[PDB]
Amino acid sequence: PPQLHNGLDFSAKVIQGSLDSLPQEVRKFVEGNAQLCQPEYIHICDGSEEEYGRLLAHMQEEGVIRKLKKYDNCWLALTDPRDVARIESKTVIITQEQRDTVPIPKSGQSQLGRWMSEEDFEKAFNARFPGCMKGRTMYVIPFSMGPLGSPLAKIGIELTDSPYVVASMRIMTRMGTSVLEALGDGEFIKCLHSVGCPLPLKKPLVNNWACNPELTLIAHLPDRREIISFGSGYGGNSLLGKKCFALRIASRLAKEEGWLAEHMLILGITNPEGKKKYLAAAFPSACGKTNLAMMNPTLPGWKVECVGDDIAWMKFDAQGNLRAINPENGFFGVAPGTSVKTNPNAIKTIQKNTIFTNVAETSDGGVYWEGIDEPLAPGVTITSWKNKEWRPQDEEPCAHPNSRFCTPASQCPIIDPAWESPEGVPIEGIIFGGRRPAGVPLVYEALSWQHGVFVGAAMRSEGIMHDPFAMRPFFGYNFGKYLAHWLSMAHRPAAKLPKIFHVNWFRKDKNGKFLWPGFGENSRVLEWMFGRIEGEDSAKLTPIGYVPKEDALNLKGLGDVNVEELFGISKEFWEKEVEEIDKYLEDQVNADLPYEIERELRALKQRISQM
Numbered sequence: 001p002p003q004l005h006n007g008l009d010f011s012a013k014v015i016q017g018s019l020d021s022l023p024q025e026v027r028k029f030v031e032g033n034a035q036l037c038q039p040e041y042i043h044i045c046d047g048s049e050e051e052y053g054r055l056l057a058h059m060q061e062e063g064v065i066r067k068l069k070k071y072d073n074c075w076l077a078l079t080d081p082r083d084v085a086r087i088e089s090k091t092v093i094i095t096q097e098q099r100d101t102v103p104i105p106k107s108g109q110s111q112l113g114r115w116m117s118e119e120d121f122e123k124a125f126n127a128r129f130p131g132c133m134k135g136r137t138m139y140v141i142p143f144s145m146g147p148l149g150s151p152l153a154k155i156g157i158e159l160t161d162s163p164y165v166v167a168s169m170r171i172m173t174r175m176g177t178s179v180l181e182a183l184g185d186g187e188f189i190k191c192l193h194s195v196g197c198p199l200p201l202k203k204p205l206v207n208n209w210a211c212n213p214e215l216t217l218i219a220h221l222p223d224r225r226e227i228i229s230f231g232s233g234y235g236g237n238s239l240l241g242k243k244c245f246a247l248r249i250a251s252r253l254a255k256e257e258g259w260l261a262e263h264m265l266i267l268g269i270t271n272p273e274g275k276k277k278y279l280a281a282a283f284p285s286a287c288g289k290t291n292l293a294m295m296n297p298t299l300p301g302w303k304v305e306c307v308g309d310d311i312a313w314m315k316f317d318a319q320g321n322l323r324a325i326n327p328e329n330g331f332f333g334v335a336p337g338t339s340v341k342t343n344p345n346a347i348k349t350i351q352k353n354t355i356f357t358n359v360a361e362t363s364d365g366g367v368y369w370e371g372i373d374e375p376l377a378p379g380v381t382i383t384s385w386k387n388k389e390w391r392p393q394d395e396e397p398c399a400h401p402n403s404r405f406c407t408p409a410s411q412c413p414i415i416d417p418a419w420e421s422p423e424g425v426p427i428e429g430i431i432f433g434g435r436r437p438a439g440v441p442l443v444y445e446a447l448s449w450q451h452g453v454f455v456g457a458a459m460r461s462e463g464i465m466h467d468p469f470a471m472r473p474f475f476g477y478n479f480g481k482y483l484a485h486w487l488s489m490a491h492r493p494a495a496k497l498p499k500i501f502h503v504n505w506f507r508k509d510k511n512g513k514f515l516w517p518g519f520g521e522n523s524r525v526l527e528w529m530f531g532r533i534e535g536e537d538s539a540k541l542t543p544i545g546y547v548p549k550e551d552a553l554n555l556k557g558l559g560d561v562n563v564e565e566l567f568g569i570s571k572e573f574w575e576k577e578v579e580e581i582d583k584y585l586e587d588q589v590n591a592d593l594p595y596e597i598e599r600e601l602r603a604l605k606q607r608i609s610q611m
Ligand SMILES: Nc1nc2c(ncn2[C@@H]2O[C@H](COP(=O)(O)OP(=O)(O)O)[C@@H](O)[C@H]2O)c(=O)[nH]1
Pocket: 283, 284, 285, 286, 287, 288, 289, 290, 291, 292, 337, 505, 506, 514, 516, 517, 518, 519, 522
């Protein structure tokens, strides 16, 4: 390349790999950003164990992470308290027209996304990235979302100045030299990340955790295939594959190309006859997602295995099977509530080779958090996530409520044998679910594809917040159009449309007590779904959909289960529910609401009116 000085070629700053061996477009991406961001060094990641182990020990030496002496190769990062979670208010999508990104709400701001103009984005970008990596290494992370070379996989390149992001991306994606080799001269998502703390530091570094809260901005430009993220070192903000690529960018590509990218676990369930089916399930926060993908089933002869626990990419094959892959390579799970008693499979997964963030440390070098349900031997003390002595009597929690384990998926004891099959697994049922203290039975089945898409659209995360499809924070484009996209699946000839169900593990009795044991007992609900997919006459028709019959659930060993109240459907509850859904869809979706969803709303209102 022609120059009159030497301010274009950055080969002199490469400390691992070679710019010369990068595909052309990857090199442009790296060098273009090296010019802008002004890193001291460029490290092209190879993904090797040597690379990983050395960068962990470097982070260790610098106080960025601590080694957890109780376990095999586990680490602990404690963050600046300002930078502890994915931050929705700083998360935006850039498109030429606002309406393409979010519907225009009748009043107030959209609850369904956050648009930024191209103009406002360029100003924000120019106020942040020039010189932002001064004095730091720029790491180049070539990564595959999905099994390497799968027809359903997509490749990205993440540039970052954070070793924490490199280590975590090694776990959460497939990364390294082999990905560059598979990429060749193909397309890839451009992902640019900086903690936004150029050296020399302008402000106090807190807890050895670089971040810039005031300038935090996580941007998506689907038309340019770019993700650009500044100022947070944390999770969904900095590990660009998980939410930014896997859901926001991918859902727009899926709309463009005819497939689905969804916030769903994927599981394999085997009945006592050895017959196996895969299901996908979308749950919004606090609704029981964790407990399901790694269920230890109580019913004898049943098996449950985990393909993934957070994101699903699903595309109809030539025979019309809805094929799904987990595009992730590891679990990025919320730590508190992970009970040694209640979730043995998650506990087994995280015993080695795990990076923990903002959990408590025990004096024997172990981990601790609210809801772990493991008493500590007398004498053993606890240091909180804020690096303070902590006692069970104290006011504040020992782990931050959003603290995390970041763990290799291949370590889950019930990881599914097909969790990396390149063609994906055939999905026969899709489950929606939420935390609903009242009115909503344990399980029901949608009357049709269109009814099912309406059921997804009506989901709540808890009591009162709407979280349609569990995708509220993650829509890559206009939600109305996303409903139209789901509905359009019914018109693909030969499509084998999954049965859709809605579950509620969290119905409470008169006194705020759960009416359903849940956890491994949910295997009894799964058996019902399995039989329904096989065409069994085990359902009774109600205004809201099909429910299990009189005596259809296996309740052996649960003693006295209040079936009538668990499956109770109140005309007064459902009348209010339908009015609530109508108002929500009118306000948030309005002119973008598909006809068929309006039709399902009218149908439900009419069925309830005849009660
Ligand atoms: N009663 C009951 N509670 C549950 C069940 N599954 C999860 N929970 C609790 O509800 C809260 C959310 O659970 P979790 O599985 O972490 O939901 P997620 O946030 O969607 O992953 C936690 O306190 C769980 O212990 C269940 O089947 N029954």
